[PDB]
Amino acid sequence: LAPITAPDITSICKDASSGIGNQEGAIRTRKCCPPSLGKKIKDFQFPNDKKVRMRWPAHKGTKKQVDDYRRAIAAMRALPDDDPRSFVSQAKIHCAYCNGGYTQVDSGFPDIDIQIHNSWLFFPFHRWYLYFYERILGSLIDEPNFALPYWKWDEPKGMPISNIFLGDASNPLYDQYRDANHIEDRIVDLDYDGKDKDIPDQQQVACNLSTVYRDLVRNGVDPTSFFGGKYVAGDSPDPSVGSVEAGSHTAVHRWVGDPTQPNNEDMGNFYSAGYDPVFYIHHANVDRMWKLWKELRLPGHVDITDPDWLNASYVFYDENKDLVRVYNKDCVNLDKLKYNFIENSKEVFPWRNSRPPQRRKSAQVATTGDVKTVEQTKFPVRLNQIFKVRVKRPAVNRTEEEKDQANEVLLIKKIKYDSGKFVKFDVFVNDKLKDGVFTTPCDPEYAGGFAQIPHNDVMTSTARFGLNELLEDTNTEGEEYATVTLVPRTGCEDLTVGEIKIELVPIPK
Ligand SMILES: [Cu+2]
Ligand SMILES: [Cu+2]
Ligand SMILES: [O]
Ligand SMILES: [O]
Ligand SMILES: [W+6]
């Protein structure tokens, strides 16, 4: 067993040096280390809160919920910087853990950094991060039952940035370093690639709902595909990045960050994202997606039970300025963490049925055209342009019972690129429409994207796309090969793909 283990973050820490493409021009500090107060690290104890903290949609808060949240951020902003509870200290936590603050010295690897992103540590780390953040905010205003808002971008009216975050600096929830084009009641683009789409609001809303369905159902088919790939001590730069992390979560980061800043600060980069209050509220909904993913009660939607994940741990300051070590295993049950999320109390999530519409055969031509197979192709391949290839399937016309027991999964492995820049490419499968056919940004042929916030230690990544639905949706369940189109969107000039294949992945019970 070799679980990732944060060191004494007050003894072992160094300025952030990873994932920041323009350090010279950086708007925020790279000195992201937490203050040293001489505290001894204590083990986590489950909270004894009387009530469950009920996190609320940021666009539908009561006057008290908004005022308390505003009042708490104000108090946090007033704290001396060196206070571990301060506005700046809380932002630096993200920078320390995401941009090279710590090493794996406690595991016996002092020359390897810890990265909690692009791995199965993604969800539980941010869960713990927010747990303490919330409890700190509550303490500052003496509200024992204080709860964060969440950015419900899975709800149409929750998709624009809530107006509680807007205005000027007289509003504590305001951040000047945001994309000026995206703060004027504009609808978030959950599959943003750095350029505004020119599409009707109704269509952006519909595709956003399809993005949530894609991240949580179409591609989030099991723990590996949803949480991200296995990451243990000794592992130096990926593992595979999860569906939410490389999907809606990354899109929102780049959508909010100010593209006129050198690293698209604040939200556009891990090192600066925490200086925007909306960052935590975005991640509050990401945290909620883990809960929703379980609540779907679909096969494969189970929590990780690998000891190497369960026993991984981080260290945070709490509201008492004590150092607390927390483990992944202790954050899986929200009841025990004494918070949850106000839900709609309706039959269904608004995105629950946003599976792309079935492609009509009348809209398709016979074949995907003249295209070579993976075996006829020389890898690696460069994505300086669109790349198409036929991938051998492990089987054709699988039964519902077989599809119920294993996901057919497209693997794009050995994705090599400079990660000093934001990267995105899109993936389409069995695209073969007749000329003239109406298309949208969320057609059934669209498998999703690979999107990566900068995290240069070149870097090597892996993406996993679910095909059980898509092959049905494109009428290609009987075809021996599946035709894969990779479409570069940004940062792919130097990017290389080393392996492409399709596998049957048994659904874990
Ligand atoms: Cu994030
Ligand atoms: Cu993060
Ligand atoms: O993140
Ligand atoms: O993040
Ligand atoms: W319009």
Q: Within 13 A of 6's CA, how many CA atoms are on the CB side?
A: 27
Q: Which of 87, 270, 279, 428 is catalytic?
A: 270
CA distances from 430 to 129, 216, 364, 370, 474 (A): 41, 22, 10, 13, 7
Tell me whether residue 439 is exposed, middle or buried, using C-beta atoms within 10 angstroms of its C-beta: 0 to 12, 13 to 18, 19 or more.
exposed
The residue count of the chain comes to 509
- Comparing CA positions, the residue from 325, 337, 320 lying closest to residue 84 is 320
> From the CB of 273, is ligand 4 less than 6 Å away?
yes
> What are the CA-CA distances from residue 310 to residues 241, 248, 414 (Å)?
18, 25, 27
The residues facing 490 across adjacent strands are 424
Q: Tell me which amino acid residue 1 is.
A: L
Query: How many Å separate Cα 80 from the centre of its chain?
Result: 31
3-state secondary structure of 127: helix
Nearest to 269, CA basis, from 152, 461, 117: 117
Instruction: Give kind and range of the element (H or E) at residue 446.
Output: strand 446-452
Mark 453-487 as b/e (b = at least 16 C-beta within 10 Å): bbbbeebebbbbbbbbbbbebbbbbebebbbbbbb
Residue 182 falls in the annotated catalytic set? no
Whole-angstrom Cα distance, residue 349 to residue 384?
A: 39
Ligand 4 proximity of 128 Cβ (cutoff 6 Å):
no
Instruction: Say if residues 119 and 245 touch (Cβ distance below 8 Å).
Output: no
Nearest CA to ligand 4 atom 1: 270
Q: How far is the CA of 444 from the centre of ligand 2 (A)?
A: 30
- Residue 437 near residue 467, CB atoms below 8 Å: no
CA distances from 404 to 228, 357, 399, 468, 507 (A): 22, 21, 8, 9, 8
Does an H or E element contain 410, and which? strand 406-417
Angle between the N-to-C axes of helices 87-98 and 122-140, in degrees from 0 to 180, rounded to the nearest 10: 170
Burial class (CB in 10 A: 0-12, 13-18, 19+), 230: middle
Q: Coil, strand or helix: which one is 62?
A: coil
CA neighbor of 212 nearest in space, from 93, 353, 411: 353
User: How many A from CA of 204 to the centre of ligand 5?
Assistant: 10
| Residue linked to tokens 């409890």 | 135
| Per-domain residue ranges of the chain | 1-346, 356-509
Distance CA 129, CA 70 (A): 19
182 annotated as belonging to a binding site for a ligand = no
Is residue 236 within 8 A of residue 112, CB to CB? The reply is yes
Residues 6 or more apart whose CB falls under 8 angstroms from that of 136 comprise 76, 85, 90, 318, 319
Q: How far does the centroid of ligand 1 lie from the alpha carbon of residue 121, in Å?
A: 12
Which H/E stretch holds residue 130? helix 122-140
What three-state secondary structure class fits 36? Answer: coil
The two tokens of residue 366 are: 């016979």
Rounded to the nearest 10 degrees, how much is the dihedral formed by the CA atoms of 70, 73, 74, 75?
130
Element (H, E) at 78: helix 63-78
**Ligand 4 touching residue 270 (CB < 6 A):** yes
| 100 within 8 A of 12, measured Cβ to Cβ | no
What does this entry list as its resolution, in Å? 1.8
State how beta strands 387-392 and 381-382 pair.
unpaired
Cβ–ligand 4 distance for 123 under 6 Å, the answer no
Q: Are 143 and 50 in contact (CB under 8 A)?
A: no
Annotated binding residue 126? yes
Q: Is residue 278 within 8 Å of 172, Cβ to Cβ?
A: no
The response to whether 59 counts as a known ligand-binding position is no
Beta bridge partners of 323: 317
Q: Which two tokens stand for residue 150?
A: 């969440």
Spatial distance between the Cα atoms of 488 and 384, rounded to a whole number of angstroms: 7
Cα(488) to centroid of ligand 4, in Å? Answer: 23
State the DSSP H helix or E strand holding residue 210, giving kind and residue range, or none if neither: helix 201-213
d(CA 176, CA 277): 11
Residue 190 phi/psi, 5-degree rounding, is -75, 0
Beta bridge partners of residue 325, listed in sequence order: 43, 315
Question: Is 270 labeled as catalytic in the residue annotation?
Answer: yes
Known catalytic residue at 283 = yes
Exposed/middle/buried for residue 339 (C-beta within 10 Å: 0-12, 13-18, 19+): buried
Burial of residue 440 (number of CB atoms within 10 Å: 0-12, 13-18, 19+): middle
Rg (CA), the chain: 22
Distance (Å, whole) CA 447 – CA 484: 10
Ligand-binding annotation for 283, yes or no, is yes
* Top-level class of domain 1-346: mainly alpha
What DSSP line would sit under 294-359, residue for residue?
HHT--TT------HHHHT-EEEEE-TTS-EEEEEGGGGS-HHHHTEEE----SSS-TTTT-PPPPP
- Tokens matching residue 116: 């909690």
Give a three-class secondary structure readout of 213-244. HHHHHHCCCCHHHHHCCCCCCCCCCCCCCCCC
The distance of Cα 396 from the centroid of its chain, to the nearest Å, equals 32
How was this entry determined? X-ray
Token duo for residue 499? 């392996």
Q: Does 253 qualify as catalytic in the annotation? A: yes
345 bridge partner residues: none
Q: Where are the alpha helices (DSSP H) in 348-505?
A: 400-403, 468-473
Long-range contacts of 178-181, Cβ-Cβ distance < 8 Å, separation of 24 or more: 178/256, 178/257, 178/258, 178/266, 178/267, 178/276, 179/255, 179/256, 179/257, 179/258, 179/259, 180/258, 180/260
How many helices (DSSP H) and strands (DSSP E) are in the chain?
A: 11, 16
Task: Provide DSSP, 93-108.
Answer: HHHHHHTT--EEGGGT
The answer to the question of whether 249 is labelled as a binding residue is: yes
Q: Tell me how many degrees the CA angle 214-463-457 measures, rounded to the nearest 5.
A: 125
Rounded to the nearest angstrom, the distance between the alpha carbon of 200 and the centre of ligand 5 is 4
Q: What is the 3-state secondary structure (H, E, C) of 243-295?
A: CCHHHHHHHHHHHHCCCCCCCCCCCCCCCCHHHCHHHHHHHHHHHHHHHHHHH
Pairing between β-strand 481-490 and β-strand 387-392 as defined by DSSP bridges: antiparallel
d(CA 374, CA 325): 47
